[PDB]
Structure 1
């Protein structure tokens, strides 16, 4: 069937859209070539609609059915909890889209009567009505990139009231089931240093390893009604409260498998028969679907000892080599199988025989050395997009931000350390906001974090070596260097000069600021200070990992 059908009504914005990087002193100190940085808008939405709209031809086979039953046998060990309205409300992001029913995310969080009464009514409706399609809004998402232009991504989400009900029925499921089903291959359970450990150990565990990332084109659109019902069949193997079982069955038929699209102006926009980007089960569902399809395709292709690492639609496979011609051919057979499964490639996959050449989760493993000269593996990526976004959020007030999560994810990197930390710490210090908690977007989720806690966070997510790395690899330095010339970012000597200046200010204030000076900026001085383990709340991160978007943790 068609992933989408359209009536001709437009994908509308509900406010003016900015597509150019403003000319502003603070962002200009970071990046000079402002004309290279752009934000997507609803003006490119029709181009995206064309790409995401197509017919899906799915053909399932014995390997798929075998793998599906192996997954269900493991899902069968799961016992899941129904969340109370209060628990689901506290998981609601503060700046989450308001309901069209007279209340907003803050009213939800405060347990206001209007909000709670309405959420309760929505829940009872899920229990009563198993068929009426649930309305969704379609919007063009505003995302920032560097030229060489991407059309806007389209986001699909239901009303606030429904989102809170999804958490009630399925939060515990999305947070515990993927690990029970996929074990070590479930990527979202890992901190960055633990993802590196698994990739390095899996690689080292093969006699002759071969690995590849697999890019599925427009994954959400490739997701069929069958996939979504199969996904539900895995959820139904959990021990569930009667009302959760019903709310899952109703959400699946009324929301998950598809439904009507309304634009911001309230106009009937079209119809969806594929994955909605903005529902609770998107991340877990995509992960389970991508894992099932890949696991079965490996058997079909006869790849050997194929270890998966799956994070939503992001896939990396590491296996035993059968020789070079054999590998090329088996990988083409793997692609042919995924294609029948309705998971066709975007960029053709290629076999790799070096772990550092594989890009997965938009990152690659690289190597540096700690103060004692020992090798430390860590994740990095091309810094273009992170720098373009840091510049945009510097010039444009963003009640939400992406730069802080970037520093946390990429802390051991040369670029996050010399540029990002230096830049944002200089500014927050001048503005007396080092201590101000920020609402940090990490993938689709939300975390409240004070910049002053960065050292403790980094030491846990990456180890104390993140503050001592040096001797980065030539390829990494090469890549960083070329991006700075391309974006007009001042050279590293200038960032060193800035860091020394902010480091001295951080030290002079003492307290938590001085801890930031000592750990975050020790790379910038000779007279290194003693780096000992720093004398919290990492549970919301560690117990379930990243369980999906529109989730808030404090």
Structure 2
């Protein structure tokens, strides 16, 4: 089966698109080489369309069958409930794409009569019709990157396929509670989205330590969503149905599976029939949970097929890391090849072939890696980081083009103890907020593929809660980390770290002169910048702050909102 068919109608924008970073003193302060920073647009949609369109064949075996059986058994211990309409509405992000039926996110969150009455109608149609395909819109994503000639110019736009707002709210009623319980039940600690960055680091360290002679790899499936088959998706439903659920939930879930998840017609922004999908929809509630579960099933089965010795896995959607016992250099190369062939048979062929790695810092999971620095008192402290190129390119763009969802606040929160967040992103954005005079204002941002709302003035307590007090005191970063950062700065025409330190000293002073929470931000976030450091004490506010489920509730990604 072909992942997609196409009518030939173009994929069209619903708004004007800019592809090139605008020259502006605010963004230029961050980096100068603006011609290297681009935004994907609908102009490249066809290019992506060709990539994601291909035939899928799937040959299963005893290893797959056996894993599936264990997983269904594990799922049967789950009891899940329907969400009320009001609950589902409140999880709708303030700027979710509006319904075609005369209402939008604002009306959904405020429970307007038009919105509510429509959603009830959609829910009833789900309950009474399990057959008629639900229409979806296909859009080219606008995301910002830095160019990389060494790997061939510019990425074409990613495609997003999603149904009407009314259907999306119904998805939450049927399946949200499941997203909060199911992944953990069937895969346990391997489910990555439940972890904060610190917890992810801890897990990776544990896995590494549990091997006598550790060897890790990450596995990159070539366009995962497209490799997911109709069978895969119906298998996911049978896993959902293995849970203890009310009858009404069972009905709606089956309808959504047959009418939406397994496939359906795609329309462009102009309403023209664009094509037909027979794979994973990239823009539904179950995209992330489904990918996570289906990836785990195929990966674990492939491990058994290949004879991977004592595998420990970390799965986040299509993102997959396997840590196991090395069997020797050539043996590992052999075993990884066999793993790949099994994954390929299961309909998950690789993009780039996996490589055995014997250094944990070199293992990339969700574009991130574990690194090490020194805390106060001189002890080694492990933390999550990544190449800052893309965060920086996006931070520049977002400085001059204001988006309702900003990437930079997410990066500051996730990567708080990193040297690039601390010296560059923090310095830059606190400056910008003072210039704009909007320090004390809540902002929406994406993180773990879902939406959150945070006041920048609350960052110290948030960072302490998530990362500990040492996030403000770390120094002596690894040579691998230091070189990568410096290279990224040079590549972008950004000031070197020493310049940022001077700039941070001034930002800090301005913050302090404002008193209140702002002075706290100044004293805590920028202690690294002064000659005579303050002695930092734990913030009582951090303790009164409950983020222990902050990442789990994100459900791995999507049209989901939390404060």
Of residues 508, 513, 516, the one that matches 2:518 is: 513
Residues 449 and 556, structure 2, Cα contact 8 Å, conserved in 1:
no
- Offset of 1:537 from its aligned partner? 4.2
Partners of 1:176 and 1:544 within 8 A in 2:
no
1:541 and 2:550 are equivalent in the alignment: yes
Cα deviations by residue, 1:248-291 (Å, 9 ceiling, x for unpaired): 00000000001000000000000000000100000000000000
What does residue range 464-483 of structure 1 map to in structure 2 within 5 Å? 464-483=469-488
Give 2:208's aligned residue: 203
Matches within 5 A, 1:94-493: 94-148=94-148, 149-493=154-498
| Superposed displacement of residue 539, structure 1 | 5.0
User: Are residues 1:3 and 2:3 paired?
Assistant: yes
In structure 1, C-alpha distance between the alignment counterparts of 2:465 and 2:338, rounded to whole Å: 41
Distance 1:545 1:73 in 2: 25
TM-score after normalising by structure 1: 0.99
Q: What does residue 42 of structure 1 align with?
A: 42
Q: Deviations over 1:41-94 (max 9, x none)?
A: 000011100000000011111100100011111110000010010000000000
Question: How large is the Cα RMSD of the aligned pairs?
Answer: 0.9
- Comparing 242-251 with 502-511, greater Cα deviation is found at 502-511
**Per-residue deviation at 1:492?**
1.0
Conservation of the 8 A alpha-carbon contact between 2:4 and 2:275: yes
Q: In the alignment, what sits opposite 2:82?
A: 82
Distance 1:467 1:539 in 2: 21
Residues 188-237 of structure 1 deviation map (CA, whole Å, 9 limit, x = unaligned): 01000010000001101110111100000100000000000111111001
Q: Which runs of 4+ in 1 moved over 2 A?
A: 542-548
d(CA) in 2 for partners of 1:543, 1:476:
29
Q: What's the CA shift string for 1:303-346, capped at 9, x where partnerless?
A: 10001100000000000111111111011000000000001000
Match of 2:151 in 1: none
Deviation string, structure 1 residues 105-134 (Cα, Å, up to 9, x no partner):
000000000000000000000000000000
Contact 2:512 2:522 in 1 (8 A): yes
1:543, distance to aligned residue in structure 2 (A): 5.4
* Paired residue total: 554
Structure 2: unaligned runs, 5 residues or longer: 149-153
**Given the superposition, is the C-alpha separation of residues 100 and 545 from structure 1 closer, same or farther in structure 2, using an over 3 Å criterion?**
closer
Given that 1:63 and 1:300 are in contact with CA atoms closer than 8 Å, whether structure 2 keeps it comes out as yes
Q: Quick one: distance in 2 between partners of 1:539 and 1:310?
A: 20
CA gap 1:545/1:398 in 2 versus in 1, 3 angstroms: closer
Equivalent position of 1:58 in the other structure: 58
Contact preservation (8 Å) 2:220, 2:320: yes
Shift of 1:542: 5.1
For 1:552, the equivalent position in structure 2 comes to 561
